[PDB]
């Protein structure tokens, strides 16, 4: 009475973090959600054991970059000079 999840064979295309805060979100979100999905489904046995460490390293690098990009009022935006965006802050809260 259950549906089998995706084997994640074709999910290999899921990107190093780079760019500004928006570009860093673009980089992390697919990789972070992919590693979370793989952890939930416990299918690392076939996707490749080694790539998880690289994924963790890159997502940690992006998280550190965004921690550096955090405004003094605990706000997240594309630029520190630019006014904080509520949607960006909510998305960063969800990612955290």
């Amino acid at each position: 009475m259950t549906e089998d999840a995706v084997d994640a064979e074709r999910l290999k295309h899921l990107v190093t973090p780079s760019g500004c805060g928006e570009q860093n979100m673009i980089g992390m979100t697919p990789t972070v959600i992919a590693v979370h999905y793989l952890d939930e489904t416990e299918q690392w046995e076939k996707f490749g054991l080694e790539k998880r460490q690289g994924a963790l390293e890159l997502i940690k690098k992006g998280y550190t970059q965004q921690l550096a990009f955090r405004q003094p009022s605990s706000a997240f935006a594309a630029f520190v000079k630019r006014a904080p965006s509520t949607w960006l802050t909510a998305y960063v809260v969800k990612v955290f």
Partner: protein
């Protein structure tokens, strides 16, 4: 650019001492090293046991730790992994290794092998770990009916019991017959279960054992004389039997047994020995296939019924597994390496065996090509053959055939093997051959490996030592260097084989150079050595008396036990009538060693496709900071 390597057993175990050999090749000065293990995925089961590497040890060390078992019992149906992430100074290297749930062995010993209803069952449950040492763990035991429904459940602790748990059960009066089973399993790892079988039957003890041993443990299909079977009967206590014996023969194919109506014969035994023959005409006419050749493969079986002239006692004895074969030898390639090296001897371990399965003794083997090579098998049925190999990349087609005299050439045994060449790194032609003697080694005597080498003279100064490791029973036993002065091409390393090496040790080795454009490479090898299977200690029982033999019933006698100090012996005395009635499911050292060897991680008797293959075949995991790391394993058993 120094490297830092971690070598750990391929599959880890719960609650045991697991060693991780650490090297730092071409490293100057001391380097701190910390080894931490984390659960995979997520994140800290253990982060202790750091070490400081010193040039005083030539920058080599080992860190042993025991991972606690807890998150480990939540999920078991799917394989679970742990991450061994170690930091060498500022450089970090990590590798994900598999973790099994098996933690030890339980050898169940029942005093008898057949019980009558209304009789108590006395049995023990030894508790030993992977290294064959007493351990304190909690066991569970369930005793199954013939159908397979548990009847008794119990829980015991081996703590302060020195690994022996004597127990009991009084068989209920109204019970089903047939085989019963006792299944015991460690409480932490409920998916691995050990068992024994005891039979409940209506019996009264016999009075004499009947032995039927055919003259040859097979039947030649073209022999015109027929099967030659000898029936012998001696009383339990050592006297000859006079009586009449009925025998019968049949053909046992698959699971269906068909008897031969024209074969039953009464052959009176005088002085306790009688002989009957099954003429080939009877064998052909009993079966419905007149083609004698189509009968091959099927096995005969002899059922002998003996009755004394008193007529007071009758005993049955059956010898099955007499194979009908056209050739008296079966050549096996179980122990031969499946991969070789160009331009080195390629030691073949052919295993000549009788058709029943027992090892063959004093049989000459030969290679069809270059027939100038010929050998003769040793005690354990293994014949050392050596075939020189041309330095070529083509697979080598080795065929071995038995060349025993007084046997027609249409009657010997033949077999073929495919062996593929070791593949270097980028066709650099840097190999390593590790020659060795392989015989029925006895513990104590030394062995001299030969760390043979082959590489161009342009890089003979870069290599100055050979690392080596010794697997045994599932964990690294010794790990050291082997210094070699430049300009020297053969290095003999004397290995001190103690009694700790029983029954086999999978010696590996490797070095490391930089060549071609300046890229790192590793070259490895493996050897499987079989040691004679006996105790790691010693125990024997004999009699105190030296006179007045044949004790009368009711007379004191003193039996002497010569065992290792501090040990604990457990005794049981069984009437031999019981073993006459049912001789299956006994306990002896051979089965213990078979069970221990059946759980070894290594799954090929040496060499491999390349260095990663060699290490995985041994049962290791060699990862380095540069990147040269072994292939991942995620299955408990290597493919068949």
């Amino acid at each position: 650019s120094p490297m830092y390597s971690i070598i750990t057993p391929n599959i880890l175990r719960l609650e045991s001492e697991e060693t991780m050999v650490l090297e730092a090749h071409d490293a100057q000065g001391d380097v701190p090293v910390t080894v931490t293990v984390h659960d995979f995925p997520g994140k800290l089961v253990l982060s202790s046991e750091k070490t400081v590497l010193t040039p005083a040890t030539n920058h080599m060390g080992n860190v042993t730790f025991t991972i606690p078992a807890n998150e480990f019992k939540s999920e078991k149906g799917r394989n679970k992994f742990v991450t061994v992430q170690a930091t060498f100074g500022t450089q970090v290297v990590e590798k994900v290794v598999l973790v099994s749930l098996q933690s030890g062995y339980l050898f169940i010993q029942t005093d008898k092998t057949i019980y009558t209803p209304g009789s108590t069952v006395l049995y023990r449950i030894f508790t030993v770990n992977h290294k064959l040492l007493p351990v304190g763990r909690t066991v569970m035991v369930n005793i199954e009916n013939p159908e397979g429904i548990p009847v008794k459940q119990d829980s015991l602790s081996s703590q302060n019991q020195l690994g022996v748990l004597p127990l009991s059960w009084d068989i209920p009066e109204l019970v089903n017959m047939g085989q019963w089973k006792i299944r015991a399993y460690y409480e932490n790892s409920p998916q691995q279960v050990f068992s024994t079988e005891f039979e409940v039957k209506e019996y009264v003890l016999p009075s004499f054992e009947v032995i039927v041993e055919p003259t040859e443990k097979f039947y030649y299909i073209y022999n015109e004389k027929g099967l030659e079977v000898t029936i012998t009967a001696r009383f339990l206590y050592g006297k000859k039997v006079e009586g009449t014996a009925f025998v019968i023969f049949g053909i046992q194919d698959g699971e269906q047994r068909i008897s031969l109506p024209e074969s039953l014969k009464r052959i009176p035994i005088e002085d306790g020995s009688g002989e009957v023959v099954l003429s080939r005409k009877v064998l052909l006419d009993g079966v419905q296939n007149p083609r004698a050749e189509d009968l091959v493969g099927k096995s005969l079986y002899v059922s002998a019924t003996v009755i004394l002239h008193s007529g007071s006692d009758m005993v049955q004895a059956e010898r099955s597994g007499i194979p009908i074969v056209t050739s008296p030898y079966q050549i096996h390639f179980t122990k031969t390496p499946k991969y070789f090296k160009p331009g080195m001897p390629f030691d073949l371990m052919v295993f000549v065996t009788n058709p029943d399965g027992s090892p063959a003794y004093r049989v000459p083997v030969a290679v069809q090509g270059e027939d100038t090579v010929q050998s003769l098998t040793q005690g354990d049925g293994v014949a050392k053959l050596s075939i020189n190999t041309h330095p070529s990349q083509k697979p080598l087609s080795i065929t071995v055939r038995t060349k025993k005299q007084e046997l027609s050439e249409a009657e010997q045994a033949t077999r073929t093997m495919q062996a593929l060449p070791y593949s270097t790194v980028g066709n650099s032609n840097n190999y390593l051959h590790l020659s060795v003697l392989r015989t029925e080694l006895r513990p104590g005597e030394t062995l001299n490996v030969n760390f043979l080498l082959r590489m161009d003279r342009a890089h003979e100064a870069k290599i100055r030592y050979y690392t080596y490791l010794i697997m045994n029973k599932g964990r690294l036993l010794k790990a050291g260097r082997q210094v070699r002065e430049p300009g020297q091409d053969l290095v003999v390393l004397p290995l001190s084989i103690t009694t700790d090496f029983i029954p086999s040790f999978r010696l590996v080795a490797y070095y490391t150079l930089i060549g071609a454009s300046g890229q790192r490479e590793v070259v490895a090898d493996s050897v499987w050595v079989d040691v004679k299977d006996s105790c790691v200690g010693s125990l024997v029982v004999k009699s105190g008396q030296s006179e007045d033999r044949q004790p009368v019933p009711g007379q004191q006698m003193t039996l002497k036990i010569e065992g290792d100090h501090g040990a604990r012996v457990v005794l049981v005395a069984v009437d031999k009538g019981v073993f006459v009635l049912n001789k299956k499911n006994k306990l002896t050292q051979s089965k213990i060693w078979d069970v221990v060897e059946k759980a070894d991680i290594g799954c090929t008797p040496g060499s491999g496709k390349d260095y990663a293959g060699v290490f995985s075949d041994a049962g290791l995991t060699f990862t380095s900071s540069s990147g040269q790391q072994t292939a991942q394993r995620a299955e408990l058993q290597c493919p068949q």
